[PDB]
Amino acid sequence: MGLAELRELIEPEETDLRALAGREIAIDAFNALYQFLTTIMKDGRPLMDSRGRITSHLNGLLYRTVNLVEEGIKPVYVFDGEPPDLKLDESLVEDAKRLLDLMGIPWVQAPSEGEAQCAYMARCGDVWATGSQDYDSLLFGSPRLVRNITIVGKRKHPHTGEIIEVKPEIMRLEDVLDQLGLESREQLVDLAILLGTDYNPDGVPGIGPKRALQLIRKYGSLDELKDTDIWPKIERHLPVEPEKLRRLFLEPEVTDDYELDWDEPDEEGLVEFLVEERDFSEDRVRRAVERLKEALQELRKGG
Numbered sequence: 001m002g003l004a005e006l007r008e009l010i011e012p013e014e015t016d017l018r019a020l021a022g023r024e025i026a027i028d029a030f031n032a033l034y035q036f037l038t039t040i041m042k043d044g045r046p047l048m049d050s051r052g053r054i055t056s057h058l059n060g061l062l063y064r065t066v067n068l069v070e071e072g073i074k075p076v077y078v079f080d081g082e083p084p085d086l087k088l089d090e091s092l093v094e095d096a097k098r099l100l101d102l103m104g105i106p107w108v109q110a111p112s113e114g115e116a117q118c119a120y121m122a123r124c125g126d127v128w129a130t131g132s133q134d135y136d137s138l139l140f141g142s143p144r145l146v147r148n149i150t151i152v153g154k155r156k157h158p159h160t161g162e163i164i165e166v167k168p169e170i171m172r173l174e175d176v177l178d179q180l181g182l183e184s185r186e187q188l189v190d191l192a193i194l195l196g197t198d199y200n201p202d203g204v205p206g207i208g209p210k211r212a213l214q215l216i217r218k219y220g221s222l223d224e225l226k227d228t229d230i231w232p233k234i235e236r237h238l239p240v241e242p243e244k245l246r247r248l249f250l251e252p253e254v255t256d257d258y259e260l261d262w263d264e265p266d267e268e269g270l271v272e273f274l275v276e277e278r279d280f281s282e283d284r285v286r287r288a289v290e291r292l293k294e295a296l297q298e299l300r301k302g303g
């Protein structure tokens with residue numbers, strides 16, 4: 001799974017949404033849509049319009065984005081481009097972009113990895129953090145990652161009926177390094193390569209997470225593990241040469257070509273799209289548009 005395996009060591013800062021009031025967050029769009037598609041359901045299936053087309057993605061993107069802006073959070077959604085060679089239905093993606101345009105919520109087309117683009121925007125100081133369920137943006141150098149941003153809330157377990165609560169949680173790159181006893185992001189990347197990433201998802205069986213971490217700490221780097229006895233097992237399992245894997249995380253393809261704005265929603269266009277084409281409740285959509293205008297306004301009047 002990757003860095004997620006060292007969750008006991010990482011331990012984020014558990015917070016609430018109102019603590020992120022005023023923060024711009026670069027949310028990985030593919031990750032967000034996946035959460036919406038897999039968790040917003042009716043009788044065990046995704047929400048659908050009267051023609052049978054999926055709507056869970058539009059539902060989440062509209063109503064949860066409005067909720068975030070009501071807590072003072074300014075989201076920007078960032079979409080995957082072409083993945084690197086080692087690495088969602090396109091209609092869902094175009095639905096998403098159309099919706100955000102109508103809502104006035106900014107988005108960016110990444111040239112390759114969305115999570116890398118999010119991290120770059122955070123490094124440049126154009127957003128405060130990245131927002132995803134994945135830990136990838138840290139490896140791409142994001143100074144801050146907020147997890148659970150698209151799924152904050154409470155539910156009952158179908159089985160136990162207990163109140164499961166999901167809260168937003170913050171991880172700061174600098175603290176993650178300290179928590180793991182590492183010196184640099186470069187070592188974090190080397191560690192992640194041992195554990196397995198999207199570019200090498202098997203990791204290195206035979207090396208558990210604690211062992212991986214100990215190795216990186218003791219020997220310093222993946223490069224320096226060449227002179228050791230464990231190397232052949234590593235070289236066997238790494239699909240490509242290690243430096244090319246490192247380069248993907250340390251020098252990801254990203255773009256400068258964006259300018260972040262939060263515009264007024266287009267009430268009538270939203271109604272045409274969601275209500276008339278996708279069978280959303282008109283009263284609910286219209287009310288969401290009013291809630292959104294007011295929330296944007298409340299952020300404007302303090303700067």
Ligand SMILES: [Cl-]
Pocket residue numbers: 063
């Ligand atoms: Cl709602």
Ligand SMILES: [Cl-]
Pocket residue numbers: 279280281284285
């Ligand atoms: Cl609805």
